[model samples]
Target chain A: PPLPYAHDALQPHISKETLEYHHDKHHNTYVVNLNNLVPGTPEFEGKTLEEIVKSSSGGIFNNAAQVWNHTFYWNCLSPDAGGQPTGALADAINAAFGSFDKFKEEFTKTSVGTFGSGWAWLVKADGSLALCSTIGAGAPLTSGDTPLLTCDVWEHAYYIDYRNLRPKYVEAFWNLVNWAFVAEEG
Target chain B: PPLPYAHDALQPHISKETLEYHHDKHHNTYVVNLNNLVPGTPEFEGKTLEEIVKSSSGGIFNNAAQVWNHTFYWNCLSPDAGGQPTGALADAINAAFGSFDKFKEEFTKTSVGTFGSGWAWLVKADGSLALCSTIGAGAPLTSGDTPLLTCDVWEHAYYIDYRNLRPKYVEAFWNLVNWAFVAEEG
Candidate 1:
């Protein structure tokens, strides 16, 4: 799927160069790789991307899940989005993590502490809102959790703009969160 | 450990910006983290970096191994360096891979195909030359392999210089190979 916003839409927080390399280069490569990998394989011939992500292993799983993860990640951010979620989503955050501020702090810590190429996710698991860190194309899709929002911690997602400061990048990420999209997912 | 050369020594191939972030920031963070983690821990106190890498797990292993790996990686490249090896290293390469060009091709492919944060290595294992890849701070120290050379496939190693083009960075890396250092290690 194409990006929901223009290439430069999420500026300052996520530069146009970062978006181009991330969405156009890194994310699209996953799509292209998945398409190349699944064509003649009987296990994947009729399977949806989510199905492949849930069922496959190795290269197929990596590519299929990355495609899904990147698409979801794109929707989880918007130019003027961020701030606390209101309504049910806000209630869930409060009930599970005490307060929205506490949840944000915990989530930021988890995202920053993720050691290598991976993602930091807000996920709903067993009816509880929780934070998750998944390494190298890992997704909640395979783990029976519903992904509410994700921040791609893979360096390609922020390296163009932030270099080695993942915490700084993730801190800036708060200003661009699509809480509506996250709430809808929740 | 300080970098073996000046910051801009490997420029055009590996940028000064990349070296500063990769060595000064990423590599130094590993050192700082390992130092903070090891104080008063009996298993780590007085252990050399290599010994810590071999025996440690979790954060200790990650930081200690990364510190060693980055130091080794720095010595494996030099300004105005590149070209085939000679002496025992060249002989071993020929015996294992048919020719230096073939060895280079295979190593490049293995390094480029490394899926995520990792290192691609040329090592001597059981008296034979081999190509190996270790994911997320993995190193040959724990595996009993004598590492001859390494290229860090971690995104921070090249993102500032090559963006999403790891293959390009690896290609440029050929123009900076410190063959003498690799041969000495072998």
Candidate 2:
């Protein structure tokens, strides 16, 4: 995925330095590993990222899955994003979650409540919306569900700004959510 | 085990602030989770840590195993420690890996190479020495291997002090290795 904004664009919410290392160093390493692992493995040799992620296991699966997850995760952030949803997406969320604030509370709780290194996602499937957490390199691809939004809970995502304060970083994440991206997920 | 030195004592090599959060917040949470988990569950109630680690699965096994790993890890460091090994353990390293430098080379590479939240261990099993790494809450205890020296390669282990530079944090770790503790592992 491309950076939709300048590296410094997410600043004040996420520092320029934080996004710099997180995208360039952390996420780029996954892409590099994925590229390295996909060659030579007979089953994964010519597969697309989704095909490899859904069908493979071990390192091939991990790197491929993360490549997808982080890319999808990138679209969930934008410099001009955040605040409440609107139109049909907002109506759909209210029908499922009572209100947008309730959805935020639930999503934030799941993101922080997820233990260890992994992610929290808002996914839609079978006409219902739900919250899910997956541990290390986990992806929604395996389930065939549509991811509405995501927040990476990995320490590198926020440790530069928040140190050990995960909840604050997670709470502050709402200030940067790309609601336009969420509307486009379905 | 409680830290062998004050949280500040491992400074410059590993920071006081890193230790303060790592020990007081992180390690203690594992202990607290273990306590919360292990009361009357028949498989764990009367079991030793090693016993639970060997037989349990899921969260019970994870928390119990981490409690053991962190305790054993803390004892492997000392504030005054640094320098190559010089004991029967030295002879053992030379016998197994061929030389002290070879041992450090292999261990450092593995510690740096371990992919994510995990550990790098120098484990002794039977009459041989080998380097082992485990992901998530994985334990050498599960394999009946004895941990001689272990380096935590988890991002949180080095994120505060080194940010994305895990290799540097791992290299600096040699300065705090407690060789005396390693000698007694057998």
Candidate 3:
């Protein structure tokens, strides 16, 4: 699929070069891998990516989950994203986190603090918003929650341009987030 | 001995509030922990943080390495740091990785791609530059190279700012790097 925005649009913050490799290569590979892994399997053939992820098994389920995760991961970002929330999303954030600024802080802390190659997510579970981290491809989707926003903490996600400085990358990501998409999810 | 710049100097990229916690609280605790762990031991009394990291064994080494690592980490960043490099450091990176751009790709992939709490490092050993990732606190320093630069892939480093979007944190780190220090090490 085509990138939702021009390749260079996230520039200065995210280099066009990084995006090319991350999207075209890393993410695309997951799509290809998932397609190759899932077909013709009795348990997974016609299932949506979400269905396969929720079922929780090895092999087909893992690949299918990764594909679903990467797609959701990509959609979670946008060129015009970040800043603050609006409407119920904003109110929910305030009600849950006290304010958008606090929410950003808590979000960043959870994501960056996660121990390994994984993801940090904002999910609607049991009618409340929660922050969590998943090792490797595990996600809140596995627990039957609706994901709102996520950040990929895999080193492949940021080591090149940022080197040892991952915090700066985290700071800039705030500028490129699709808050509207997150709001819509709620 | 002293902070290279004022506490509030790197503002926006790093909030003063964050630094107060990062330096005064986090880093200072490491120092206190190192001090408490090392003294009265035959092997560790009167050693510098670097010396302790290079030592063979003990809780002293663990605490000291963390203290040294965090100090080096803090200095590695600055609001005015980052951008392109120059001289042999740049030339060597190009020669080894084909270009600075590719070097970044290899570096970040190794870092974010690492499985758990650890670090990605640029080290110079016996006149050669290498890229390596460490798992957990003490492993990187044990790898037998003089560290030139490091990215803390652990969540505490970027969680407050970037959340699960570690790639974004890694990207911004490039902009705030103290390249002069890295160049000097090389």
Candidate 4:
């Protein structure tokens, strides 16, 4: 899938160069690999991307979940975005984490401290908002949770702009948060 | 521990900037975290780095293993190193993978194909040479394998210089293999 916004739309925070390689090269490879792989395996041939992610393991699951994750991730950011949530989403954030500030702190820490390639998420599970971390192409769909938003902690997501400072990239991610999209997803 | 050689010594292949972050910041944080962690844990106080890796889990294991792995990884490269190993190591490579070229091909594939943060190792396990892939601060120490050589497949290992082109970084890695260090470790 093509980026919903221009390559340079998220700039300073996320460079044009990063998007070209990340979406065009990294995400596209997963899509290409999934297309190539699905046809050769009858069990996976007709499954939706989410279905494949939930039921499969190894290469098939990795590629499928990654493709889905990247697509969702791209939508989670926008050009002039970020601030606090509104309405029900705001209430849920306050109820679950005590306050929006506390929620942001925990979420940022979870995303920054993810040990390897993975995602940090705000997920709706058991009728409440909570933070979740998933490793290496993992997704909340596997556990039947509703993903509200995600911060991709994979080094590839920020390496071009942030080098080894994931925390800084994540800090900047706030400025690009599509909170409206996240609320809608919830 | 400091890198075995000057940071820029492996220039064009692994850059000075990469070494600065990879070693000084990333590797040192592991060391710093391990020190902070070990002092508060009675069971880990006197353990060697290898012992901690083999017996511990969570942050201790992650930090200890990363420190050891990065230290080992630094010694695995040299400024003007590359080409076939000689004598006993050459014989082992031939015996295991049929030829030096074949061994390099297999190792390169294993390293490049690692899905996330990890290491690809050439190990002497069960009295023979074999390939191993370990995920997220994992080390061969836990498995009782003698790791002869390793390629750090973690994105941080190459992202500064290679960005998302891990295959390109891995291909360049062949031009910097410290065969003498590998043979000595074996």
Candidate 5:
């Protein structure tokens, strides 16, 4: 289990209610389902989460990657977050997307633009950061790259706080992003 | 707006909370969005809902068809609904799907198996009945078929009442389906 601040710590930007449903109910269910599914299937039995994600399809792939994606997603936000990056990550952001503003634009647009349930990711590819959108439990790890940061565009991620205004949710996510985590990963 | 029955009427099954969110929020937003989108576009100007759904793609198609689909979904349920079909619809269900029990089984399976946000439908095609599941604002009218009944398999439709047990929600849906409207449409 990935430890972080209390559920309400990211409040106002991400409400306690949203986290209760998104983390406590939604994320926990994925973890439990993956555990249950793995016990019965030979190909998935004894495999690491990443291995299951790479090999499994249908329900197995969806739940295993959801377990991974949501854990990363939880770590990518902090109450201390906001503004622009600094140091190597700052330089990489500038190189990949022209500027921090441009980077934010691409991430926000892709996350809001994705249809239905999915995620928007900033992952290192070709030695630079790139934006990607994946629909319905799709993960970056399947393509041989791990994401630096992700903003869940799933309605459950922001529905209580932002409702149908996914753009507003994307805007708030940029404000709460943990540069500390992104820097570590990047 | 197509008026739905009192929110509490579908209780012990779909619940007042589900209808409030599904209708007042989710379904209403689609209508408002379709209006907002149709106004400034030349091809969509003065077009009917079916025409817009058939001729358009991307965002326009999504919002317009969602509007149409939700209205049809509401009309397919009734506070007084329960039991099984009779008359032509009953005969047709038997001929097409073997029996009403088999029809429910197929519909329940299709709705549960749809992967993500979408709808399951019983529609008329080629002088007979067919079952289909459409992902994200998909409409049977686009294929020249008339929808006789639909169950909103979107998470919002069942999340409050069933909470990830979509199969349970679908089971309850059969007990509330307005066979009157279906028989009329069929």
Candidate 6:
């Protein structure tokens, strides 16, 4: 499907050109590659992206997880989004984090500091939300936690736009995030 | 100096509360630590942060460089930023990487792929610009180059906010980059 918003909508935070390449080129390539690599193979045929990520062996698992990861990655952002979260999500955040502002600080630090290409997630695990990051193609989905929110730190996702300044990029992602979607995931 | 913008100016992207902690607390701690470590020493007395970073040995280099690095890091970002670059800087990027887009792709990939506590930089050496990542704390300046821009991939830079999602953090960084400063550095 076409991207959920116009390419330039997230600009000057995420440039239009960057999104075009990231969504159409990088993410699409992964999807195409996964489709090419899987299907018709007994191990992955007819399996959902989540199912394949969890049950398949090595190569299949990696590609499947990446595919699912990218989709989740896209859904997690928006141009007009951001501001402190509200409702049950906000309440839960307050309960767990002491305040929404504290949650934002803690989350931004984790997202920007992840050592390499990976994902940072706000996940519903054990009936409460927690923040975490996974190295290279890992997902909490495999561990039975529901992913509430995610941010993709792979270079392909931001390099064309951010270059050597990942902190500002992470900050922008926080603005564009869809907290309602995350809260609903539980 | 006070922050270049109001603490909440970048809000939604980065909350004022988060910025206060990141700049006032985290970045300030580095500055305070560096002063404590280097001020009383005869060898380091009266030296610039850069001078100390370059001249000091081992542990001294680590603390001194962290001081210099953090200072540069804070100045490298802004709330209202991004878009294709202009003038000599743009020309140099095109000359080096065929186009700004390609340069971004390469730089992003290199930064995200770095394994651990380190930095990704855009540098000028021998009249040419190149993209590189420095592992640990002290190698870039020692290599005889000027850093145009740097992204700290260390966990503390972003862990509280992003967790494992380094790519998203990196992407958001593009929004507030101080490109004019980098261009001037060249």
Query: Proportion of native contacts in model 3?
Result: 0.10
Model 2 chain B scores worst on lDDT over the 10 consecutive residues at B1-10
Compared to the true structure, candidate 4 yields what TM-score?
A: 0.90
* CAPRI docking class of candidate 5: acceptable
Q: Rate the local accuracy (lDDT) of all candidates.
A: 0.68, 0.64, 0.60, 0.67, 0.65, 0.60
Docking level for model 2: acceptable
Runs in model 3 with CA error above 4 Å? A1-12, A40-43, A59-61, A160-164, B1-186
Q: In order, how many clashes per candidate? A: 0, 0, 31, 0, 0, 38
Model 6 agreement with the true structure over A104-163: per-residue lDDT tens digits: 777766665554456667777668655555355667877788756777766555544333
The global Cα lDDT (0 to 1) of model 5 is: 0.65
For candidate 4, what's the TM-score of chain A, rounded to 2 decimals? 0.85
True lDDT of residue B182, candidate 6: 79
- Candidate 3 - CAPRI tier? incorrect
Q: Distance from true position, residue B108, model 4, in Å? A: 1.6
lDDT comparison, 1 vs 6, better candidate: 1
DockQ of each: 0.51, 0.37, 0.07, 0.52, 0.33, 0.03
Kindly report which residue stretches of model 1 are placed more than 4 angstroms away from their true locations once superposed.
A1-9, A31-35, A127-129, A160-167, A184-186, B1-12, B40-43, B160-164, B184-186
lDDT of candidate 6 at residue B127, scale 0 to 100: 59
Report lDDT (Cα) of residue B177, candidate 1.
55
Span of ten consecutive residues with least summed lDDT in model 1 chain A: A1-10
lDDT of 5 at B49: 73
Q: What tens digits encode model 4's per-residue C-alpha lDDT throughout A1-186?
A: 333345235455676767777776455577654444767543467676767766786653477677778878887885777666677777777777879778877886667776777888888766555554647567877786878788678877776543347545455677765687787433
Task: After the best TM-score superposition of candidate 5, give how far the Cα of residue A101 lies from its true spot, in angstroms.
Answer: 3.7
Scoring model 1 with DockQ, what do you get? 0.51
